């Protein structure tokens, strides 16, 4: 908004804006070292080793 004064308010002024993960629930450590991973879950009656 622009309140009767000429002053401007912005999302930067009202809120902390950062490029972060969409959820903060599940985190992983590989030997105590910060890391992610691709946990693959096979299809129903697929081909496994193929």
């Amino acid at each position: 908004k622009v309140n009767q004064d000429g002053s401007r308010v912005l999302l930067r002024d009202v809120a902390k804006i950062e490029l972060g993960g969409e959820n903060y629930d599940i985190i992983a450590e590989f030997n105590g070292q910060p890391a992610s991973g691709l946990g693959i879950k096979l299809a129903t009656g697929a081909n496994a080793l193929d």
């Binding site: 009202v14 809120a15 985190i27």
Partner: protein
């Protein structure tokens, strides 16, 4: 936050669609524009999260 985003926005999409994958559980989350509001700074300029 940084690795989990890259693992999703460079690799994850190529899997889960490849050789008969049921579903992939990514160990983290891809980046999102996270806006962290402030109640007092909202109250200051007469603003609701709406």
């Amino acid at each position: 936050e940084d690795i989990s985003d890259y693992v999703a926005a460079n690799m994850k999409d190529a899997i889960s669609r490849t050789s008969g994958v049921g579903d992939v559980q990514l160990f983290g989350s891809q980046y999102a524009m996270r806006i962290w509001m402030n109640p007092n700074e909202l109250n200051k300029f007469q603003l609701t999260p709406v």
